RNA sequence: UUAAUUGCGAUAACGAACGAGACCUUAACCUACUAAAUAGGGUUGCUGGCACUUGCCGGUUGACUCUUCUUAGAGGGACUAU
């Protein structure tokens, strides 16, 4: 019945967060690492603390996990999220420049008073039976 | 040029933790002595008849926690054992029973070092010193400077420097993303290195001692002159680069990636081989990296001892 | 009492030779009896762990009670 | 899921407090440190006996030396470690 309550969890949490370039995957260097960076009263809190502080390294190490952040993770997430495709995803790129609009849409576009490139097709108004 | 190929001819058992240092004498060529996580060293006799390349001499008990680095004497019959317990060890390689107890670090001892000749003891330990010890056992320097812990110290070897000198040059650097120069007589600062982006695993010389290799966390290699005070060339590991070594025979740098052992031929500054050996019963995310590296006298076998409580032995076989 | 000293003199006897061999004689030796001997009650070289419970209030024994009356 | 309102979580709930855990005593393991005629051991004395080969089992508050066991301080050690 090992289970690790919060505060072993919630201070390794915050070990990692602030501490990830620092710690490693052996758990005496990151003992000894939780002896001089953190000031834990007695020494079995201490090695529950760098146990878990392995453990979740390790996940980390497999990939990324919920919860904890850091700034390396933190900024691989914001470098993937600025991703933007040089080639274009809209203004018939593809399909030879021709998009596919039924007859509706097609009077909603001349009733707007503008002439854009279509293509009718019917779209065979019998409904699939699912 | 030099299609040369290394391949692993025997297994050293009988270790039970990471053999976290190794050490060989030029003088003894067929000794080896091995410390390891279970804080014990192994002196090992090198026999060439079939598949063990080694048969263990002397287990040297003695030590209450890790023993990190290892360092034997230029003689070959004494050897300097570096442990967790904040002390150091002097042990007859013979005897098997302990000379003298160097006390004096308040952190565990990460590193030692040997002198040129029989004077001298270096160590550095996680209280952010270096101290300076005789072969009696008491400490004669305190060597400070270093904001943080200091992972590795080895001496560079003095080769032709001026006829003499009785100077005596070494290398230091840790966590705190530096490496520094030392020289001794007295006993003062040199040069410093910066090029480190995270904080430095490992340093080592090599063996004529006028280029120093650091590798550190980001697996960026770095090679330096010391008599020049300059960069020699950098290079980049992409994985954890645990330990690195020097050859006596080639111009050559071992590196213990996370992944495996590269080989950087110096000469060429490409990578030639790689050596990846063969678990079973893994999930290929965990497979035993090295933690130690050591050339023979020659140049001609490779001692790597990993997380697996085993040394793994490259005799290097030129298959044409 | 009497058999609590006859298992610590086969385990004294044990460590003794294995102690023996590692710092006098070799190492295989030393791995050889070791590997003879934790092949056969290993205790013969580690010590056994078990020893006595404290013995608590309310019952005669370690671990065990009083009887309850109930009526 | 846990021995646990112990955690992973989902969430008109968010942050917290007591309890549990943590914590102390005790039981281990320490041929690593400090040491000890109010604890033990070795060598050597001075003796007793038997053997006769230099060895065995003894006695002595005679000396030198050591701390493995016996002690108790600072520490290490296990955190489900691989
Ligand atoms: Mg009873
Ligand atoms: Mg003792």
Redesign the interface.
Known sequence: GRVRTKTVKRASKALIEKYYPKLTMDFQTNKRLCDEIATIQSKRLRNKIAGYTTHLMKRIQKGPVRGISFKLQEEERERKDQYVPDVSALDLSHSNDVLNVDTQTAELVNSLGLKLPLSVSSVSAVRDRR | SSNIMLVLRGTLE?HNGWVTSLSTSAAQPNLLVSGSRDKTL?SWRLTENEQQFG?????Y?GHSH?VQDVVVSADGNYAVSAS?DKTLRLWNLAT?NSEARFVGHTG?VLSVAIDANSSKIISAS?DKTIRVWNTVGDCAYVLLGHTDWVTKVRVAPKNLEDVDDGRITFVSAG?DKIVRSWSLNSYRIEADFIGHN??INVVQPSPDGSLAASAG?DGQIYVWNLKHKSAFMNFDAKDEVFALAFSPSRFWLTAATASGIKIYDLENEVLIDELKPEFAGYTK?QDPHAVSLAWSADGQTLFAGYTDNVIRVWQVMTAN | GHVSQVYAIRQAIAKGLVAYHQKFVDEQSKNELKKAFTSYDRTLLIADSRRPEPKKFGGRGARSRFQKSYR
């Open positions: 009988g192994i048969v263990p001499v002397r287990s008990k890790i967790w098997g565990d996680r966590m995270n904080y966390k995310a």
